[PDB]
Ligand binder design. Structure first.
Ligand SMILES: Nc1nc2c(ncn2[C@@H]2O[C@H](COP(=O)(O)OP(=O)(O)O)[C@@H](O)[C@H]2O)c(=O)[nH]1
Ligand SMILES: [Mg+2]
Ligand SMILES: [Mg+2]
Ligand SMILES: [Mg+2]
Length: 179
C-alpha cells in the first residue's frame, strides 16, 4: 500500500544534521510536535504528486561510536551525507570517513551530499574564526567537485537557520530513493 523509504543522515558532529531534520519535520502539514531525536521517525512527504513515508534516522551523538553507528545502516534507501560550509575539516571527512563507511554498509544506496549552514559562508565572525586556522568557508564548486568525486546522486546546499534549500534536500533524497 504505502511506499516507505529509510533515510539515514550522517556526517561530523555539530555539522547541522539534527537541525536539518527538525526544520524539515516542522514543515510538514498538518503541523505535528517535532521531537529532538529521530530514529525511524516517520515523515510524510509529497514529491512529484506521490505520497511517500520517509523514515528518518539521525546519527547525531553516534559519530564516534564506530561500532554502534553501523547498526542503523541495514535496508537504508537513501543517505544524506552532510558537512558544514563553515567547516572545511567536516568536508574533508566526507571522502576520508563517511564515504568509505557508507559505501561499505550501504552498497548501491544513493547519496545526497549536503552542505549545511550556507548562511555562514559570508558571515564575518565565521571568516575571522576560520582565518585563525588558515581556513575559509567551503565554496560551492568544492562541494560540487566532492559530490562528483564520491559518486553522489546529487549535491545540495541548505540552511536550517533560514530554511533555504531544506525542502529541496528532502525532495532530492526522495526521488533518489524511488529511483
Ligand atoms: N548558522 C547556522 N547554525 C546552524 C545551522 N544548523 C545548525 N546550526 C547550529 O549548529 C549547531 C549544531 O547543529 P546540530 O543540528 O545539533 O548538529 P548535529 O550534531 O550534526 O546534529 C547547533 O548550535 C545549531 O544551532 C544552520 O543552518 N545555520
Ligand atoms: Mg562531515
Ligand atoms: Mg543544518
Ligand atoms: Mg524519532
Amino acid at each position: 500500500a504505502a511506499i516507505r523509504k529509510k533515510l539515514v543522515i550522517v556526517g561530523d558532529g555539530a555539522c547541522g544534521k539534527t537541525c536539518l531534520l527538525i526544520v524539515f519535520s516542522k514543515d510538514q502539514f498538518p503541523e505535528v510536535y517535532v521531537p529532538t531525536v529521530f530514529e525511524n521517525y516517520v515523515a510524510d512527504i509529497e514529491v512529484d504528486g506521490k505520497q511517500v513515508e520517509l523514515a528518518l534516522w539521525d546519527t547525531a551523538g553516534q559519530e564516534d561510536y564506530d561500532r554502534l553507528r553501523p547498526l542503523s545502516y541495514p535496508d537504508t534507501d537513501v543517505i544524506l551525507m552532510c558537512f558544514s560550509i563553515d567547516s572545511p575539516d567536516s568536508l574533508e571527512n566526507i571522502p576520508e570517513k563517511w564515504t568509505p563507511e557508507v559505501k561499505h554498509f550501504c552498497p548501491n544506496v544513493p547519496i545526497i551530499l549536503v552542505g549545511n549552514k550556507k548562511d555562514l559562508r559570508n558571515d564575518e565572525h565565521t571568516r575571522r574564526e576560520l582565518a585563525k586556522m588558515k581556513q575559509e568557508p567551503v565554496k560551492p564548486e568544492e562541494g560540487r567537485d566532492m559530490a562528483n568525486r564520491i559518486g553522489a546522486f546529487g549535491y545540495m546546499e541548505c540552511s536550517a537557520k533560514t530554511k533555504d534549500g531544506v525542502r529541496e534536500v528532502f525532495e532530492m533524497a526522495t526521488r533518489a530513493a524511488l529511483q
